[PDB]
Amino acid sequence: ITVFRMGSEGHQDIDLAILTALLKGANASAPDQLSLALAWNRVDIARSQIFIYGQQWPVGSLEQAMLDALVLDRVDFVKLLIENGVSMHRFLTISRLEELYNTRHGPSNTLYHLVRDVKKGNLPPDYRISLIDIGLVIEYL
Amino acid sequence: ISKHTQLSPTDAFGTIEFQGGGHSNKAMYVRVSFDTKPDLLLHLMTKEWQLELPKLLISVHGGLQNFELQPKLKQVFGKGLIKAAMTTGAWIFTGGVNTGVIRHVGDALKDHASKSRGKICTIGIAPWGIVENQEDLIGRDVVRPYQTMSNPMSKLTVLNSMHSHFILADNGTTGKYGAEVKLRRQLEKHISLQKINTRIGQGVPVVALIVEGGPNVISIVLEYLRDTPPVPVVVCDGSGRASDILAFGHKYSEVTIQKTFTYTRTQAQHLFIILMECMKKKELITVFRMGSEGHQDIDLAILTALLKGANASAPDQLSLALAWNRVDIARSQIFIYGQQWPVGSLEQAMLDAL
């Protein structure tokens, strides 16, 4: 139970009060709270509630969070994770780049049409785009 | 063993770039032993690192434990420290690792760099055995990346970013504290004895800043006071630890049951000897408080300590202010009611200022 009041309570905003109840009330780990905040597209909540003194993050959780934030076009979350120890020199690999190039959780783009035109309209439906096709598209453009 | 090691030359000196933080900082690092003479270190800092002699030296001490500070107190402290270090050419000596007050000064430097020009010379003197990754720091005269991300289970502390230079002190042991205090003290003493460009005869002034602290902080401040050239001390009352008890003892001085705070072995252990020595040499000690008294600015508090703490004449204070290029300090502190200036001092000051 989380009571509300306009006086002594720091959470004088019901907007802050409602969201904080779902975080501490779930009794979930830091990755789960970060995933919920990323889904809600609330970066202030993650900055204030999640990233605190000694969160003892597990090994590889922040890289997975960065991978999940990149495909969702969450620029503020990418900046926050970069500010919290995540380095792109070790995060980025060929496999992760290919996974990024084959995402669907974002605004529509015209990449597939260019790939089909370059490949002379021979790709089958549900085609797996590789880095060589991207290189061919770049050379054509 | 009795510190039985091999006196081999250093195999680690160069530049490290921190990967993981939100900024791009380059820190020159050199590892040495604890027996290195201060003169050679000063020569290395003045020539290899291309650092001119400072006009002020700030020594920051605190509690090595990872404490926390009240909001709006760590902001004014950071603003005052940054302004004092930026307005004049000063050096800042810290532990170097990312624990305690060093994290707060790193945050203050983080805020400063994004909102202003110029550079601040912050030097960290840390033991070699405590760095989390002793390896990946061996490339001599080369750039080697360093990872800012740390994990609790490593039992070791990573080097704090936003530090311009490092001097790793090694004695043979690994994973233990207490191998760089003597070197830092000797380096400070040797730097103080160096003569500034003024012809009055003043040396490089030294001040000490105390936050949080602990049982060792009382001994450190007593040692600083007992030095033949007294060193002024600035204490933050809002920290909570032995700095707060130092402020508590500062008031209504020249109270044993009120002194009992269970920070030591109950009432069976009392630090009254060292505490009363410090309170006997209490004219040099300066305290700070947000709005309770004057000098609400850390920048003003630090500079005023070096003026009244030197016990020097008005020409000496004017020369120091002229060197620091602070005219407000001279207007407020120096030029006051009846300074009885000597004959010809003001003309010499005008000649030096022109």
Curated annotation (Swiss-Prot), chain A:
The lineage of its organism: Eukaryota, Metazoa, Chordata, Craniata, Vertebrata. It is found in: Cell membrane. Disruption phenotype: Trpm3-deficient mice exhibit clear deficits in their avoidance to noxious heat. Trpm3-deficient mice display reduced hypersensitivity to thermal, but not to mechanical, stimuli in carrageen-induced inflammatory pain. In the chronic constriction injury (CCI) model of neuropathic pain, intraperitoneal injection of isosakuranetin or primidone do not reduced heat sensitivity in Trpm3-deficient mice. It comes from Mus musculus. This is Transient receptor potential cation channel subfamily M member 3. Constitutively active, non-selective divalent cation-conducting channel that is permeable to Ca(2+), Mn(2+), and Mg(2+), with a high permeability for Ca(2+). However, can be enhanced by increasing temperature and by ligands, including the endogenous neurosteroid pregnenolone sulfate and sphingosine-1 and suppressed by intracellular Mg(2+). Implicated in a variety of cellular processes, including insulin/peptide secretion, vascular constriction and dilation, noxious heat sensing, inflammatory and spontaneous pain sensitivity. It comes from the Eukaryota. Disulfide bonds: none annotated. Belongs to the transient receptor (TC 1.A.4) family. LTrpC subfamily. TRPM3 sub-subfamily. Homotetramer. Interacts with TRPM1; the interaction results in the formation of a heteromultimeric cation channel complex that are functionally different from the homomeric channels.
